[PDB]
Amino acid sequence: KVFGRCELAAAMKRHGLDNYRGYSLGNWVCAAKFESNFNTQATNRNTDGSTDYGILQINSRWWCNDGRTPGSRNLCNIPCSALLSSDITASVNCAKKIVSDGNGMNAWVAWRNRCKGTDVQAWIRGCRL
Numbered sequence: 001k002v003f004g005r006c007e008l009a010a011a012m013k014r015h016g017l018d019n020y021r022g023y024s025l026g027n028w029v030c031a032a033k034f035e036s037n038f039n040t041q042a043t044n045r046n047t048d049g050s051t052d053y054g055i056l057q058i059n060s061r062w063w064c065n066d067g068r069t070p071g072s073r074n075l076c077n078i079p080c081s082a083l084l085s086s087d088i089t090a091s092v093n094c095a096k097k098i099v100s101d102g103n104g105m106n107a108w109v110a111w112r113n114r115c116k117g118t119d120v121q122a123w124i125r126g127c128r129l
């Protein structure tokens with residue numbers, strides 16, 4: 001599923017990402033834009049043979065099992081295909097674990113490079129939240 005900006009804002013807010021670990025809703029929307037272009041089906045291979053999955057490009061190296069990242073961790077206790085569904089529940093609940101692990105949203109390279117320090121509020125402009 002490819003979410004509209006305000007649609008994803010509203011889902012992310014409903015799923016309790018609004019100021020989660022102090023990260024305003026705009027930060028999460030911005031991350032999802034530049035990680036996946038709001039596409040729940042997005043998959044991208046990493047140099048180490050791991051793969052990033054879903055609207056928040058969660059990495060098989062640590063967070064999920066994709067059956068082809070041998071000697072990796074599955075810290076969200078899911079198959080990586082769960083991260084690709086039209087329902088963002090599994091991506092959100094796993095993101096909450098990632099962001100909480102002491103690195104905050106720096107785990108998202110696109111967030112760090114394209115969102116961090118910027119006017120992220122612009123990403124929720126116009127939305128009825």
Ligand SMILES: [Au+]
Pocket residue numbers: 015016088089090092093
């Ligand atoms: Au959720």
Ligand SMILES: [Au+]
Pocket residue numbers: 011015087088089
């Ligand atoms: Au949802």
Ligand SMILES: [Au+]
Pocket residue numbers: 027028031056095105108111
């Ligand atoms: Au994020």
